Design a binder for this molecule. Structure first.
Ligand code: ZN
Ligand code: ZN
Ligand code: ZN
Length: 95
């Protein structure tokens, strides 16, 4: 480095500016999530082949209202979940 001067630091990319004015015009040039950016992370991609594997990779969704406490699948109704917990899960050494 060897460059520890007094200035500002962009809170988007991390670029340093000798003054604030030069940074004022930069913030305006910055893009707002595009063309293909992640709604979760925030990164920006210039391809649909990447963002597609990036977004899905996270899988942001719940689906059903109630979900198991183990496999966390999801059932339309509550009673349906009660039967699963006892069907698949719930099975101690004793009985
Ligand atoms: Zn910036
Ligand atoms: Zn992401
Ligand atoms: Zn389960």
């Amino acid at each position: 480095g060897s460059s520890g001067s007094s200035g500002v630091a962009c809170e988007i990319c991390g670029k340093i500016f000798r003054d604030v004015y030069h940074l004022n015009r930069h913030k305006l040039s910055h893009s707002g999530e595009k063309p293909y950016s992640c709604p979760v992370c925030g990164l920006r991609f210039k391809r649909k082949d990447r963002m597609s594997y990036h977004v899905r990779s996270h899988d942001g969704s719940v689906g059903k209202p109630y979900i198991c406490q183990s496999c966390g699948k999801g059932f339309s109704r509550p009673d349906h979940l009660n039967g699963h917990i006892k069907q698949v899960h719930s099975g101690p050494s004793s009985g």
